[PDB]
């Protein structure tokens, strides 16, 4: 149990060093949560690779990344002009909120850690609750921390009191004897969330998360943005009426437009592979081209 | 407890030594490593499924080719990756699981047959661990394919009335399958396809359906696909000449693939029963090629 | 939480040893209970020569389920199309020989009949029901020429309501998957040599996906005229010879009675003479039975 | 947890010790069902306390008890002269069909277990089936036993399509354990377990349960003679005054069941003591006295 | 107050002792026939049972008495007095504590309360607004209640309702006594108000009919709520006089003007 735990702490040390450098001493519980620490260059997308979400993205910048990173500029404004202690991203599925979380992890650059539901659930008794202490202590040590819970229904409200204990301790250490620091700082740990079913999250997270951003479907020209964005590496040279494709996708979500673009791009490559499958070695270097075929 | 996990680990190590030929695993990746199946096991291939041929070319040119052997599809960037998943749906007995067996056999993509029994663990917080192990083993066996048959049971429309472990399984699955680290640092995301099959897509968790771009309907066989189902089912069954396959294909209209299989079974079982009833007046030695079907029975 | 496992494993090993010596394995914790469901042929005191009435269903079960399943060497020339049918569903009104057909199949087949009860499938903890449904087929495959029996299968394999329950729905899906899924055949193509016999009196409640997997569906009807007289003979084999009994009359007086109703009427008609003897014998000291009574009328 | 199970085990063991002689290893559900095996001396009623109806009270004693207990007289007939599979009492409320089952419990000495509706319905998935198996296995460990379900139409019932499916899945366990595969012995003798059930309605009981309760005795409203006998049995403690009679009371009350006559006689008996205490408030200290009248009180 | 399982513990939060109950018939009024009959038919068969030991189990306490009970103060409050004077160890039961969120939970509660009452040999089960018994899981709890009633003993079940016809036919069989508790429609309400005015007395006592005839159709709880505030109505003026006369001082001088409407 110690040798495997030693491998755990070694991998944690490597990951935390690669995060910090862009040292720390951790107990064996937060050497297991620090494995779920997302390095900055591990994300392929920034705020420029997202389309349609611009007012929400400026909200997340001006209220969640500036109040949480470089807070000295906000000493003039006082205390109310600061970052909340929790933000939520709700809306339909596929609309692009996990992508917002990914862009926040990449561009914000302040100790992002994504909590999976498995790291909160432990078979043994009690130690499934010390991991929440480890999460918050790690977020307090990695000072500009952004805790993230994707599909946030593990802290949703069989009860399984041990799981109830984990949820209650998460609520308590959310805003308890540590969320009101005498140093005039909340420690800058914004527990970002996300969920496509906003109703079932019962009451507590709805009061603990002041900012709640609805990621709608792209209405009438944000789908044009997502089309111009997904089709960034495909040769659409001869005749590709992008406005028609933006107008035909009536109520498709971002993932739906993305998969439609995937099919439309597979179309020329498919109809090329299906035609030159006779010379033996298929290469298919730059020969095909995109026209239509959504 | 170690006396059981050591035997388990030995078993999965032997299974993967059989499969991977032409790797460290934790206590959970092992328990899912018993699900990895080799193409030698499944006997069915794409050349054995009659009728639904339009779905075969779609799986080949849009799932298996983009997933296995991706060097062709590299010029188009991450847009030309394989789909996140596939959902084969239709009435029962039309070829969903048979397509699954063909994908297991005729792909060469480290097929992983995930049972509902293994996702659902008794101890607390082990179902989430089993899902994380499923997606960590599908990532180790890189161009892999996770197959959840009857996927509308494990997944499915979430509600307030459901076991607290099931909601965690669903959320953990969605997180691993279209989450933060579902794309590599270079941008090429995780050549892992979740192939599911169901006969009820209106109970399959639309948030999950968003993850499955390719949703193929396996329709009920028609007059032209039934004459291929009958051909495939009747391989070894030697036909008595004057056997009219067209009449049997036209009389079995409202039947599925399995119903046509069972009809052909009960039609080829007839001459053997005649053979048995005639040899009732003597001993029962080994069989022979004497009994031919008296006619095309239906 | 450990002695129960040792008790159940020793019991299942003893049971399997009994079935084997009627003519070992390493069973895990979950199929170690299903090994208790395995019944021996010497337990079931019923044979196909003991059922009455239905005779073209007995012929069907013998010819196209029992012979393909056990003793398959006669069918190794037709291929996988001559394998045993994956599923037989005996359906019909209550009390007309469904469970008796299952009992005769358990006794006469000699194919490792396993009487699966609805309790062993329904476990308390999360995932144990799925583990039991997997262990059923695992044990049936360890004992290849095997039959799985689920009496009153409609209450266990219902039509999959949209919000019925998760444990029941997962058990249904697990049973469907292990019935004929990815790993249901062999590496060569033999369909696993397992037949799950089900008995129900509500046919249109099983759900369509499951009736697909039981391709042979036998309606067990009510006894007609010649079936009622055969049921009467088979029931009255035990009673006295007769004191001028009339059986053709009783064969038609039982207008729409099922098999169990005919058996109960015969029970009452046989109890009547012993009651007469008890009444006439109370005047004496002790009962001390003999063979005085008769059998004439029961109505 | 473990302490609760051990306490239930100790209670069931003590109840078995008190029931056996006017030791058995058994699982937890049989521990819970063992808390219902009742001693015959725990009940005050007998076959002579049951006024009115006498044909039913003879049919039970002579075709359900003598076949069930004392089987050495019915041995020659074989499995066809065994005890009936089950017994059903039906009739309007208060006509003495639970008191009749109570007398069957007392005056039979046949391991009478009284199964409550709560013992069957459990909170966890798959515990009602465990307890049904427990009751049908404990009745077999107590071979000449009786299983009384009171208000059988509540526990059982015509299983609708859209039923609870946790009370309908237990409703099939009763049928499976009742008359199923292993519901006899290798020698061919039945299981000699008789299940007695009382109900106000038989058309709602079931269609598949009523065929295995072949003995069905209706407990009708008392006529003139039955009502007179019920009156003569209810008035055993009360002291008659030489003035009144019983015929006019037996004739006035017509639609009253057994329990309605019981409550009427209770009022008629409380009337004299009522008057005595009402004329005795400032009459010394009421401690004891015998001066009733039992005059005609409607 | 002894050993008991978790369900008897769940039901123990509603059980109360006799002495802890408020005043009995001395606390209420407005009826004499109903109180007299119920008293001499229940409290006597419970208090001093030695006087009935020669009866022979026939002239014992009734097994349950229903109440027609046009709604006033829960449509009845006689159960409190019956448990208080008889020392009956009043165990209460509500529909809220009778519903179920787990399968087979209401039946467990019913068996616990009846099992519970038996440890407490003298006991008064009380079904306020008894319609959860009559009448698809409620049928099972109905059958359970019927079976625990006499399905196989100094216990009484007080059933308050509002419609005799709505009760099941197998329930009126078990509740023989049908004590009607209608609204007070006579002049006796003044005595009601008398009791309702035994808390505090106004400046003089105004016209008794002036306060009586106004509540000619009001319920008993209606009278109790009117007089609990009408007499307090001018007292609010006295508190306002405290506020206007310097600061509020602890005084004991009542000053009524008119307690009506
Ligand atoms: N606003 C958007 N612009 C561009 N692509 C988007 C957008 N929203 C979603 N997508 C596409 O959806 C895929 C993942 O969607 P995701 O953010 O996981 O949806 P959700 O927010 O429901 O989790 C990405 O590959 C991305 O291409
Ligand atoms: N297109 C098909 N071609 C040949 N056989 C088929 C086809 N569809 C179904 N079958 C028959 O059905 C049986 C299994 O049915 P399956 O494909 O598993 O149904 P489902 O797709 O509903 O799971 C196989 O034995 C096969 O013989
Ligand atoms: N075909 C039959 N021949 C003889 N007896 C029968 C037949 N069908 C039903 N029975 C009688 O029914 C009783 C058991 O019925 P069972 O087979 O359990 O009914 P079901 O098939 O509805 O479960 C037996 O005692 C038997 O005497
Ligand atoms: N024939 C009878 N003789 C004497 N008492 C009777 C008779 N029938 C009913 N009773 C009375 O009714 C009570 C039993 O009611 P019961 O008839 O068992 O209810 P149900 O019929 O609804 O089960 C007994 O306590 C007894 O006093
Ligand atoms: F993350 Be997505 F909203 F399912
Ligand atoms: F697998 Be099939 F749809 F029943
Ligand atoms: F009750 Be039988 F099994 F139809
Ligand atoms: Mg997401
Ligand atoms: Mg399938
Ligand atoms: Mg049966
Ligand atoms: Mg009763």
Author numbering:
A (entry chain B): 44 to 65, 86 to 220, 225 to 361
B (entry chain C): 44 to 65, 87 to 362
C (entry chain D): 42 to 64, 86 to 361
D (entry chain E): 44 to 65, 86 to 361
E (entry chain F): 86 to 220, 228 to 244, 254 to 362
List passages from the publication reporting this PDB structure.
The AAA protein Msp1 (in yeast; ATAD1 in mammals) extracts the tail-anchored (TA) membrane proteins that have failed to be correctly inserted into the ER membrane. TA proteins that escape this reaction are mistargeted to the mitochondrial outer membrane (MOM), necessitating their removal. This proofreading function is performed by Msp1/ATAD1, which extracts the mistargeted TA proteins from the MOM to facilitate their subsequent proteasomal degradation. Here, we present a collection of three high-resolution Msp1 solution-state structures (an ATP hydrolysis-arrested Msp1 mutant and two conformational states of wildtype Msp1) that address these outstanding questions and begin to explain how particular features, shared by AAAMC proteins adapt it to its particular roles in protein quality control and beyond. To obtain a homogeneous sample suitable for structural studies, we expressed the cytosolic domain of Msp1 lacking its 30 amino acid N-terminal membrane anchor (Δ30-Msp1) from the thermophilic yeast Chaetomium thermophilum.
We incubated Δ30-Msp1 with ADP•BeFx, an ATP transition state analog that in ATPases (depending on whether BeFx is bound) can mimic both the ATP and the ADP states, and Δ30-Msp1E214Q with ATP. 3D classification of Δ30-Msp1 particles generated two distinct structures: In the first structure the Δ30-Msp1 hexamer adopted the right-handed open spiral arrangement characteristic of AAA proteins (20950 particles analyzed). In the second structure, the Δ30-Msp1 hexamer adopted the same spiral arrangement with the exception of M1, which showed less ordered density, indictive of a continuum of multiple unresolved states in the Msp1 reaction cycle. We fitted M1 into its equilibrium position, in which it closes the seam of the spiral. This structure, henceforth referred to as the ‘closed’ conformation, was based on 48861 particles and resolved to 3.1 Å, approaching 2.5 Å in the stable core. In the open conformation, M1 -M4 were bound to ADP•BeFx (mimicking the ATP state), M5 was bound to ADP, and M6 contained an empty nucleotide-binding pocket. In the closed conformation, each subunit displayed the same nucleotide states, except for M1, for which we could not assign a nucleotide state due to its multiple conformations that resulted in a mostly disordered map. Upon modeling the protein into the density, we observed in all three structures extra density in the central pore of the spiral, spanning its entire depth. This density likely represents an averaged composite of a mixture of peptides from endogenous E. coli proteins that engaged with and became trapped in the central translocation pore. We modeled the putative peptide as poly-alanine with the C-terminus juxtaposed to M1 and its N-terminus to M6.
